[PDB]
């Protein structure tokens, strides 16, 4: 099913998604942004996630810009958008209300939409009460600002602490997590998650199912120009990379790519297929900084079908780290 | 009474209201339509109802350009549509919020309309939580956007869901349901839906009286030109008006003629005023291709009186189905 | 206390109001109408009411002019308008959600107001379901197309039902009922509505306090030109004047004009007085058909303190009447 | 930690704010208040507080025009505003619904805001029933007019019963207190609102931390011209200023004094530390009549490391009134 239900939600998304982290407005030109949604929402990509964060603002308003100047029915498109830093005034960070509400006003004004259709907390809030942040995500939707909220990075037992505020208060509870998911990152996924969505249907909509373009292989020889880990900010991905973990992880890569090249595939495409073996995960959201590359992760739903119990078994004896 | 409540609602309909299935933006004439709305409103017709699925939309262009070119009070009307078809796109189905919402809205846009009396969902739907679905229905109430909501095409099973619902969130319970009924469809009408009025005040807004057309008798020797089941996209209908089941119904039909020779009146008008005397349907509506057949239909009314215990009688002995 | 807060609530009125029945967009010419207005703002009177009924809307187009040309502050201002019959159609009646939200909002343009202070239910609605306009009445208080609600004419058993609904559902109680109250109409405001007042806080706004302007004396040689009881249309009211009854109160009015000489006031402003003695009535609304008989009725609070236990007693005697 | 979270909530104020009572629109030049407010903004303070009562609205029109001229950004301010003194007709003032939407849509307009960040009852209304004032408070944050609300000069049983009010009809409860404190005014601060931040999370955001000025010293001579004891209306404070009492406690402040020259501070800046010693007071509302007096007061912050627990036992032993 190319098609699925975003948790236990009536939400139809594309089983992969299109995320805007680092690229839009930022990495790639905004000409090149619009070739990757188009080619995206061509192929039936109808999700698009984004940040209020991501180039301070800035891929929101080339998301946006990118809608409006195609014509696209907003009915055809889902969007998500995550809240949590906002600026840097002491008031512009942060799950409170009035950070969510001037938030998502801010991203809507430069998204130039009515509303998103999932607004996320980008991460927990330790400093806001969690019934000031479901009131204020029920209060959104209520407004008319976004249809659906959700979750991100948030403990599977901070999730249920929503639900429990908005079953107690009579609320609206979040519908999906938003959680990192790749062959490296994979305990949360597919230990909790499967249990949070029996009990209170909440979905999975997973990120970096490449670990950032680590799984390409493509940092074998130590850090490519133009790749991420080389741009300015990503120092810090540089340096997971280069560490002692980081090599562990390559060297599993060569022993990855033989079964890839057996099926005729490519790394990337087994990894994204790998990543959507799961049906509790809803959407990977893909990144991409070039057409080539999100034209091969879309063919990572042609791998979906030669993934037997066997192949399956062979990864996890090569990755050593089923949980 | 020639008006009612719907249900044990506050809102009072005709007996019969027009609706635009097949006809409206698509069978007919945008003329024939004004014409049929001028006749039954003239004649105290309040309801009219149409669906965002009716001609693509144009059924509901038609009805709002009527209204708005006649200047009737809006005060005066009760308008329905129904939602679950609202486009191509995988999302622009369905009873998720984003649909409901989206397609409401889009219907509110075509019919050049603030809201309408009831909003329906046009069928079920299993992809999405009755939670979720009533919650949107509540939130277009509240917004304005309609009055009331009922449901078509439920069983009573799921519509007491949608109750149940209702009352443990504190939510808004539909109305009533939107069902078939006519002399070869009569079970859910006259055995289930008595008691969810009886026990949730839902009520009943009965469509196809006539089948379809066919218990006008026009079949009888195969299908006539410009009939319905003669146009682009029924070959269902002419499927069924030919099947064995639908050739034993025409039988039946003949021993009815004759009881509405001697009643001095139709068939159609017997089948219309049959629909009626259950004092349970709330509102019979109408489907008529042209004037003719809207003003005979509108008939039914002075046939009423005249449907005694034994004439009632002698049709289940003709039909052989009560239930 | 000249102000006094209506029922439990916050709001505070002048314990006389001046109403609209009859009179405005009637009886009485609209420069007339701005005199009344102006002489009871002018005194402190803060509480004007009228109905989507009185002279088919014109009373409300009146009272709004007269706002807007005098300038006066809206928060000066205790607005309060009626609904149940507005218009002709079978859906321009009652208290179903349609027609309270439809008839408000066509007093509010009518009025040229963004909201009146207490919308009222006129009469009650056998064929509306408390619990439909009690939502009705609560949605467009949270709208903000009214302050508050009332009901009028309703029993304390079916106010208590409204209370009860409010209760189990969440939603807001009304705050007042606007019952009749005179000499010769006493039984309701002085058993029932304390017995309310103390359990669920409903206060008591009357009307006609001089019983149609019969409590004056006027008819006591028959129906004098230019009297209420003279107009087209009332003549029920002259049928009550000359009624037997109607009779067996005039002659009571005579005994108590000697109460009236004695104080050294006139009947209306004793009778008017009365109406107030009682702390349980938060105001009492006038009627009038010329300033001079407004000047005298507002001379009423200067009757308040020669009200003693002995002349309440004298009038109790001659009424017959005590509850 | 100069920003600390309001009570329990996510709004996070400065540890100061800058209040408007007698300066704004009335004691000093517009002039005079901008150069206040881009001082206090300059510095990080984040928090503005506000009132209708204030100068008969123009401390908010004052502070209004600020924010528009300067260009800063809403998301980086806190504004607060207070109602319950909105005019002089009988409605105009209080905590009723009618009182609370229309003072603060009035005090919004002055303001040129779409928004407060927090709407507090000036004082308690017992004219009005809480449950009316809470639900009113919950309307017109659900309304977008307010994020939060909060109490002020409210004792802590009020307080609580807001709160009982919002949990018994799940609406929203109050955040902070607006209370006095300072040197010679201790006991609700000290005592009473530490219990209520534990059981319901209400902050304390407080006031007049140096007496109206008198814990500056300068009345230790009499009533200085141009201070605030001697201008027109202010004869209450000079009253207070030269009893006995306002004797006794100009005496402890020469003893205070020499504690401030010892710790190389003025007595205004020590008072002022002296109340944020207390991590449960979320912010101090300070005032100033000059640019030297808020740069002064600013200071405070200096003071604070150097506030040991033998330093505020000198302190306490000075005051005598330890709670
Ligand atoms: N909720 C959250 O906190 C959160 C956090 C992170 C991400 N996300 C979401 O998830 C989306 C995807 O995350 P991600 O961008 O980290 O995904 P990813 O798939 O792990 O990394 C994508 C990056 O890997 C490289 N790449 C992609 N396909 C490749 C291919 N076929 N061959 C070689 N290199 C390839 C590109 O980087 P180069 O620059 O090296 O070419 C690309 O930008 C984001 O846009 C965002 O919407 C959410
Ligand atoms: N909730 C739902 O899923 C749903 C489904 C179906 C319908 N409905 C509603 O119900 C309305 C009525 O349904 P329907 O149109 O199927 O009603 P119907 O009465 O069963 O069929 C009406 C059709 O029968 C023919 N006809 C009508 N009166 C006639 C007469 N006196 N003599 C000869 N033929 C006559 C006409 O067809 P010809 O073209 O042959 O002349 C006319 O278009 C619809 O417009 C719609 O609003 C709702
Ligand atoms: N909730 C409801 O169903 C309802 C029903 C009725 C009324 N009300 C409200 O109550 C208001 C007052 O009712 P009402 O008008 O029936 O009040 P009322 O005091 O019983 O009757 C007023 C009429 O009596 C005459 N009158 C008044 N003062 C007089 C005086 N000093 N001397 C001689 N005649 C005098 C005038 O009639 P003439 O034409 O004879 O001069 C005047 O129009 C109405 O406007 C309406 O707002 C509400
Ligand atoms: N919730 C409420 O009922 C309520 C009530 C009162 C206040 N408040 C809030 O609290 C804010 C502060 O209250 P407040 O103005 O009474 O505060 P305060 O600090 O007690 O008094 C400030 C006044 O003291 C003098 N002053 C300030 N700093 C000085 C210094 N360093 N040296 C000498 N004199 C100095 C100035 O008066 P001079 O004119 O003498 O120079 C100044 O206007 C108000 O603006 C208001 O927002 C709220
Ligand atoms: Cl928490
Ligand atoms: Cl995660
Ligand atoms: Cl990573
Ligand atoms: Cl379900
Ligand atoms: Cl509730
Ligand atoms: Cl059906
Ligand atoms: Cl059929
Ligand atoms: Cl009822
Ligand atoms: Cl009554
Ligand atoms: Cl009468
Ligand atoms: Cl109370
Ligand atoms: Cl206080
Ligand atoms: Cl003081």
Redesign the interface.
């Known amino acids: 099913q190319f ?1 699925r ?1 975003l948790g ?5 998304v ?1 089983c992969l998604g299109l995320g805007t982290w680092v690229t839009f407005g930022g990495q790639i030109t905004d000409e090149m942004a619009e070739q990757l949604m188009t080619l995206a929402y061509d192929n039936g990509i ?1 999700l698009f996630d984004t940040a209020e964060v991501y180039a301070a603002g800035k891929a929101e308003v080339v998301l946006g810009n990118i809608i409006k100047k195609k014509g696209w ?6 969007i998500t958008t995550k809240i949590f830093w ?2 840097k ?4 960070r ?6 969510i ?3 998502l006003k ?1 991203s809507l004004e430069r998204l130039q939409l009515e509303y998103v ?1 999932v607004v996320f907390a980008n991460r927990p ?1 330790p ?3 969690m019934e ?2 479901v ?1 204020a995500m029920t ?1 959104v939707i ?3 600002m976004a ?2 909220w959700g979750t991100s990075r948030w403990s599977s037992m901070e999730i249920m602490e929503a639900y429990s505020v908005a079953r107690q ?2 609320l ?1 509870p979040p519908i999906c997590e938003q959680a990192e998911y790749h062959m490296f990152q994979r305990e949360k996924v597919e230990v909790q998650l499967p249990e949070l969505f029996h009990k209170i ?1 909440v979905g999975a909509m997973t990120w970096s199912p490449l670990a950032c373009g680590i799984v390409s292989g493509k940092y074998d020889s130590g850090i490519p120009p133009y790749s991420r880990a080389s741009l300015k900010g990503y120092q810090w991905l540089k340096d997971k990379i280069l560490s002692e973990e980081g090599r562990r992880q390559q060297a599993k890569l060569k022993e990855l790519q033989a079964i890839a090249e057996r099926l005729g595939c490519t790394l990337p495409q087994l990894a994204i297929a790998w990543c959507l073996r799961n049906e509790g995960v809803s959407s990977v959201l893909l990144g991409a900084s070039n057409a080539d590359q999100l034209m091969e992760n879309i063919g990572a739903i042609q791998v979906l079908p030669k993934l037997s119990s066997s192949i399956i078994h062979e990864i996890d004896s090569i990755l050593g780290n089923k949980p």
């Open positions: 098609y239900n236990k939600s009536g939400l139809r594309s109808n029915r907003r009915s055809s498109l889902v906002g600026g005034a002491e008031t512009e942060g799950l409170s209300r009035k950070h509400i001037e938030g801010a259709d809030d400093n806001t009460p000031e942040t009131r209060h209520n407004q008319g249809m659906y208060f009579n609206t249907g």
